[PDB]
Paper text:
One such enzyme is 2-hydroxyacyl-CoA lyase/synthase (HACL/S), which catalyzes the reversible cleavage of 2-hydroxyacyl-CoA (2hcCoA) into formyl-CoA (fCoA) and an aldehyde or ketone. Originally identified in the mammalian α-oxidation pathway of 3-methyl-branched fatty acids, HACL/S has demonstrated remarkable catalytic reversibility, as it is capable of condensing fCoA with various substrates covering a wide range of aldehydes and ketones with different carbon chain lengths. All the enzymes are tetramers, specifically dimers of dimers (α2), where α2 dimer represents a catalytical unit. The three domains have specific functions: the N-terminal domain binds the pyrimidine of ThDP (PYR), the middle domain has a regulatory function (R) and binds ADP, and the C-terminal domain binds the pyrophosphoryl group (PP) of ThDP.
Of particular interest here are the structures of ApbHACL/S with fCoA and D-/L-lCoA. The structure of ApbHACL/S with L-lCoA shows a partly ordered acyl with a clearly visible sulfur atom. ApbHACL/S yielded the structures with CoA-ThDP and ThDP-hmCoA, as well as complexes with acetaldehyde, fCoA, L-lCoA and D-lCoA. However, in several our structures of ApbHACL/S and TbHACL/S with CoA derivatives we observe states where acyl-CoA is no longer connected to ThDP, as the sulfur-carbon bond (S-C2 in acyl-CoA) is broken. These may correspond to post reaction states. In addition, three structures contain covalent adducts to ThDP (“oxo-ThDP” and “hydroxymethyl-ThDP”). In these structures “=O” atom or “-C–O” moiety remain attached to C2 of the thiazolium ring. We suggest these “oxo-ThDP” and “hydroxymethyl-ThDP” adducts to be products of off pathway reactions. Based on the kinetic characterization ApbHACL/S, DhcHACL/S and TbHACL/S are the top three variants that showed the highest catalytic efficiency toward acetaldehyde. This may explain why only these three variants are fully resolved in complex with ligands when lactyl-CoA was co-crystalized as a substrate.
Residue numbers in the entry:
A (entry chain C): -5 to 482, 486 to 554
B (entry chain B): -2 to 482, 487 to 554
C (entry chain A): -2 to 482, 486 to 554
Write the structure that this text describes.
Amino acid sequence: YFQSNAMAKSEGKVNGATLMARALQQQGVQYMFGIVGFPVIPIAIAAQREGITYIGMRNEQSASYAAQAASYLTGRPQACLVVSGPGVVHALAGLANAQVNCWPMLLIGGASAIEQNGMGAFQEERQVLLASPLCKYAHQVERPERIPYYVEQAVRSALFGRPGAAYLDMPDDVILGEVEEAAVRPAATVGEPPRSLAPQENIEAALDALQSAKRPLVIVGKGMAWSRAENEVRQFIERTRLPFLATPMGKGVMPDDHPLSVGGARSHALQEADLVFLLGARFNWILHFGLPPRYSKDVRVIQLDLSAEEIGNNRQAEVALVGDGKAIVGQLNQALSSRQWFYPAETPWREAIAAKIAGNQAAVAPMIADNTSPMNYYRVYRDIAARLPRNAIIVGEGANTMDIGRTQMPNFEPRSRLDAGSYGTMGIGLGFAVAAAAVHPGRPVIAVQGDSAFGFSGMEFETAARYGMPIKVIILNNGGIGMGSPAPQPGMPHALSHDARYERIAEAFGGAGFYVTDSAELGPALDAAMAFKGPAIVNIKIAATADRKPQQFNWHG
Amino acid sequence: SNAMAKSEGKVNGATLMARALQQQGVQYMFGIVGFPVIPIAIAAQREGITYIGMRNEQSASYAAQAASYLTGRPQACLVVSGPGVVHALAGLANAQVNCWPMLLIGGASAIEQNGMGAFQEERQVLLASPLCKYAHQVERPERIPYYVEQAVRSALFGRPGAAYLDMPDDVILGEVEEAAVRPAATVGEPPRSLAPQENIEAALDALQSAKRPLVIVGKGMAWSRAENEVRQFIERTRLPFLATPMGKGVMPDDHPLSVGGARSHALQEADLVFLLGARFNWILHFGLPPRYSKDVRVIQLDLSAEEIGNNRQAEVALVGDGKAIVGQLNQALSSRQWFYPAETPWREAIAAKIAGNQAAVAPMIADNTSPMNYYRVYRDIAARLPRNAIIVGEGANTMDIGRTQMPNFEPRSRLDAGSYGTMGIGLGFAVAAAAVHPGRPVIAVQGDSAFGFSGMEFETAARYGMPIKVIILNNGGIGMGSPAPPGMPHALSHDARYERIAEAFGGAGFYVTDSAELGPALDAAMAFKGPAIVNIKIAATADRKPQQFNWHG
Amino acid sequence: SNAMAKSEGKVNGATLMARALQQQGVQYMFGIVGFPVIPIAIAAQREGITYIGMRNEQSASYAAQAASYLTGRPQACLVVSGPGVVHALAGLANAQVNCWPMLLIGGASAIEQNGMGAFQEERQVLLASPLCKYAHQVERPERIPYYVEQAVRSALFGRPGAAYLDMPDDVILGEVEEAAVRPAATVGEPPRSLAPQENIEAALDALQSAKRPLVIVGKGMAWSRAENEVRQFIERTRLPFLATPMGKGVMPDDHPLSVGGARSHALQEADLVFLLGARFNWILHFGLPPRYSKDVRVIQLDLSAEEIGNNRQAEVALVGDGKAIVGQLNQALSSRQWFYPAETPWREAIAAKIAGNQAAVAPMIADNTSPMNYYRVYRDIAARLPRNAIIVGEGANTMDIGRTQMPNFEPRSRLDAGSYGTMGIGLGFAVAAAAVHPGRPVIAVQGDSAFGFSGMEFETAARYGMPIKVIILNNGGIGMGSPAPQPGMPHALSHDARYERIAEAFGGAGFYVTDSAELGPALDAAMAFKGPAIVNIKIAATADRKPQQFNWHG
Ligand SMILES: CC1=C(CCOP(=O)(O)OP(=O)(O)O)SC(O)N1Cc1cnc(C)nc1N
Ligand SMILES: CC1=C(CCOP(=O)(O)OP(=O)(O)O)SC(O)N1Cc1cnc(C)nc1N
Ligand SMILES: CC1=C(CCOP(=O)(O)OP(=O)(O)O)SC(O)N1Cc1cnc(C)nc1N
Ligand SMILES: Nc1ncnc2c1ncn2[C@@H]1O[C@H](COP(=O)(O)OP(=O)(O)O)[C@@H](O)[C@H]1O
Ligand SMILES: Nc1ncnc2c1ncn2[C@@H]1O[C@H](COP(=O)(O)OP(=O)(O)O)[C@@H](O)[C@H]1O
Ligand SMILES: Nc1ncnc2c1ncn2[C@@H]1O[C@H](COP(=O)(O)OP(=O)(O)O)[C@@H](O)[C@H]1O
Ligand SMILES: [Mg+2]
Ligand SMILES: [Mg+2]
Ligand SMILES: [Mg+2]
């Protein structure tokens, strides 16, 4: 028909796709990243009918990574939408990554029709089984009338407690099945994650422990960024005058330019601290397990975590603070108003930290200042860091490209750096940047990737161009994974294409491409890329043997 | 000979495991020995751990979680490779559903033989993982202190659950240098957390506003060891309360504020419910019609934030430890005058429904005619229940009627089929209670079908001098009897002489068919210094009192 | 009243399930009823299926796979949701390891309550899947014929194994129109495959060239119903053979060509081994040193291609059905004159070691001391075992010594702990053998520990009038007795236990034996008693098996 409003239309019935779209919108899902196909086309269409922003990606890998980044950036679970069978299996990448990083996510996976189960149906798969080991919550929606219930429970399970991934299986007959409107049971709106507080004796014992320590170190993790505790943490550091270290994605909770940051003397600080205060940060590989040879064997630990089971992993916790980061630091701030202790302005600990920071700055100064071409990493970031706005979102991915950018690119706002994370994952790059451009379109999004990392997700540049996302992709091409290689005899397994013109990919989709080989070219290329009104790629050819500055300890062992 | 030089520099995995378990507070180990866990049980006893050898790993895995509940620390179930671990999956699943801690130590075939078809080779970690909070294989003996500490912590901290350690034969017998073994920290008490002060005040204001309030006291408060705080809270507020099946005893059952005798009316008519460590699962009928008002307001105290607002939204969420939060509530109550008034229409309706149900079952309690009904039988059982006894209840009618006729006056003093509705926990639970609290009498009241699942464990009780008192209510079938016959699927043996099983292992056996025999038989069984079975032949068609709603649907 | 108008156009899930099960040849259902499977058991009886109500789901699941092995068709285990299913995982795992078919039907909570914390809500398909060849939830009652057909076929065809059907409560009670239900085909006999002719001929070439050949008869041949072909093959080739524990009976244990009494020498010295439906797992010592020559040539017949060449490479592979391939071997041998010669140095060495092992246990067999040793006990047992009896053996010393002292003359007549070394199969296996073959005697010989795992199923045998004869060898411990305790030893049990009184609790006959003079009259009264019976024998605490060069495990 031409949908003449004069025709009688029954409004009693509603299908599972529409019920799913309404339940999602009610639960605060604003962004849905995916790829359509059988049987989830009606879901994405109904989502747009309710005002949800649908972002069609180029691979389910990037879609599942984008949804957890968007969840991290908004504070509520956002959705990944994938087709049955291989759609879900490609999306297991996001679930595993979200599980390891304690980020929420909602994977909506279509399934083949229930009535054809056992028959070898198109894309028939045991989807709940496969997803369950990676999920905090996984279930199949068996009938469309239960959809509000299942969406409510899946969002609550992903968001409350230690966050994780939720998976909802949607069979075809459920997506298309219809039920009476009045017969659909309502579901309550999931609110904010419940915050819990620590007992008072633990709050006072924490402050008691801090006073006794000669060389105390506060470690700020991305659990404080997730808890939205930046104000409380900045008040605590300002009030106590304690030295602090930020984790990779903990950067920005405290501003990177804060004078109390031991960032430039990280190895010395971990080695010589007699007491560590863990704020939303695990003693996993990223903090070298809290054990020798990176820490003192007798290091005392105050540990603030939402997960009671994490307390005392690897290295025992003297003072355990189990609860919400924002709430517990608020408790600490209120107890410090009854006390008057602060960490003194002049101690040997402060002197050793300042001297080591200056030594590390003096060690990288010649590399930052060296204008020879092909350029090293520190020289390239000199021009990048000079042009990064104070409110930018930075996505970093690679090995040397990522690790050197971690120290050369400051963050001043929390939740403004997205990188390989606790799983050390390549492939999150353009997925994370697309999520950052959809969640905060008023802020510049700059992705700085190595040449290898770009190849995992570089095709999502089309997605950015398709939705008018002015994402700035900067590629540091040394021609290999972690390091370049000469022309050979077969090629090295770590070898790629040092002469690749990755910037031409931008021209395929209507973006701007720039190619940098000499130091004099870098400045004008970056300025034009930031000023170009759309997505851009800047492909920088760096020295094949460029490396990070030498450290006493390898980052891994 | 002590004059012979003997190298003391090395220690094997079985000894490291026993030392690590003793350090983390494991005092009881239930299992069945065999390849390759024999040295583990031997090493455990040398460290002072009490080892109890059962007759089936099913009962062993149930005993381990029962003792964990009673002691407040994870206790051990030790089983052999292959079918040992698969037999023990029953207990892991039950522990997961009840949120009880548990440490299963499972032997495994030697790692050097993986893929060859070794004796009892199995993917044991993979099988157990979906039923556990924690599951891992110990790959090298030097890691044992680390893994024992992490498993005990994972099972005990937060929402408790099952932890599993896979112990290959080469790790059990593998030796390492004693000085090279890295020590682990001792897992302390479970961390407690509190609610925000705003939430404490919102909870108290909501209690003041309600016209028909009801406190529901769950076994989570028994696990939290929060009985003192709960009794102060109920005594301070004068609020009516309902105890869940194993929440019984947190408040004494004879307390004047209990709505136990008017449970259906209390849930149906309340306008506000205060859930204390209780879930809106099937046991509480999901907090939804037809058993509740569609507009019921909910204050929900739970340690798990993901459980908040399941099935029925919570108006006030109190996320944290039960004892700590009720402690906060008691403190905030010390600055208010409010208490629930002594005279309200809500109290009078509760009292009239209690008196109604009492008159309904009074003729069955007093009826001395034989074959007896359930209420007449429990009239003599209840009269001889010591107040410090640990009561194990198991069956359908036998358990459900025992739940109302057998009061508890202390917490953690009733063990029953639980949140999983499990038959087969009876003697395993009773064995665990007798090992943990040998100074307390242990009475298991089972139906005749329930006794069939684990009845062989009576030999375990006798072998260890555990004076467990097993009382069997024998109607001749599952849930109900049946006339003489193919036989009905639910039918069993109405004439079975189960008490003769006691006489097979030195216990005392008593057979009762008449009401005049019940009193003297219970007294002779209670007095006997050893285990005892009282087999009672009840009426085939005896049943529970009529109700408006079926317990399930 | 039949005069009342009754609508007969609808049928529910439990009835569809019963008709589907009976259509697919399910004759026996072992379970324990309760929510939500009560209608399924009642419906099964209406279609003539024999329902046996057990006392624990553990035994129920072991019973179902034993009946599948004896009947050649998957039989049912029926369990309630939640812990019923979790208790039955033991049988699935044991059926998987032994390659025996089995159909587990598990009730489930109603689908419409999923996620709510319903009574006995559980991820039952997820838990059972690693142990099953086939595991699915029946989502709608109209699908029941389809799923039953697919599950029985998946459990029975190819390498057999367990199948699991999850039956939610709203599917059990749900109704469908009679004429709307889609029919399902009847699963027939398992497909048999043959070997290429060049493999048949090369296998025969290998046999001729061997100086010390050995044929190993495994329970794969028993499951394939290949006893006729195997007997014709050993009789035609005159080859020495060794039967596995449950391969016993495929060839009569009294055949002159059995090397059973010289087992270690036959494996150690054979230059060529012909595996007939037997794996080189722990039971055959992996086919490797120190139990075999390092250069041992292997011919391997197995239905599973992936099994071929495990641990020890096979010189000739025969992938197919046991009955079918041995038929090819017998056919090809009719165009050959070769047979293994009547007199060989290999034959004399086998004879000598048998004679030496016979003389090694002969004094223990004849020793009339009380407390008795194991061999003395079995002298009276074996002298009273009917030739058509079904033997169930379970324990450590009790089972291993019963293996050599109780011959089997027919196949599929011995049921024991199997490839998984499982305790707890005893009375479930005996109940299944009594239900399936009620005209045949069923004798279960268990140790004291093993009887404690399933002893309560004696009430099941008494309730269904199954004349199972339970002989318990009580040494007062697990594998060995123990002196009185000071904490009791972990392996210790009750040497003075009167296990036979359990029989008197359920109407059976109980007998107690301590002296050797009492053993004879007690066994004769137990066999003559018209019903189940327990013979409790207090054996010596330190009695052990014949000394061997190698330990059974390592
Ligand atoms: C390839 C790879 C990297 C690229 C370094 O090369 P790239 O050009 O991106 O940066 P460079 O160091 O400046 O050369 S890192 C890394 O861990 N990894 C292994 C790796 C591969 N795949 C996935 C999913 N996660 C990974 N973690
Ligand atoms: C058999 C069985 C019961 C016995 C009632 O019969 P019993 O004689 O013990 O008590 P009665 O009511 O006085 O006659 S209850 C029940 O749920 N059930 C099913 C059931 C079976 N197996 C497992 C593991 N869990 C279960 N839950
Ligand atoms: C207890 C036990 C056995 C009894 C030997 O003692 P029993 O009195 O039955 O026989 P005895 O040797 O004549 O004294 S064997 C064994 O492997 N095992 C460990 C064992 C335990 N649990 C399971 C499920 N499977 C097992 N396999
Ligand atoms: N609201 C919250 N309050 C406190 N801690 C939290 C909260 N949410 C998550 N966490 C914890 O923060 C920790 C983050 O650790 P990790 O991912 O290792 O951070 P990083 O990698 O920055 O060190 C997790 O262990 C998680 O349990
Ligand atoms: N220390 C604690 N404080 C408060 N609640 C707890 C604690 N430990 C466990 N819980 C919670 O108590 C609840 C027990 O509820 P449930 O087992 O349903 O009780 P019942 O069976 O008596 O209704 C679980 O949801 C669990 O998360
Ligand atoms: N019809 C059949 N024909 C041939 N082999 C079969 C058949 N069915 C099963 N099998 C095989 O028989 C083998 C049984 O070996 P196993 O259980 O090790 O027996 P045993 O313990 O007697 O050695 C399995 O590998 C299985 O694949
Ligand atoms: Mg590179
Ligand atoms: Mg009964
Ligand atoms: Mg024994």
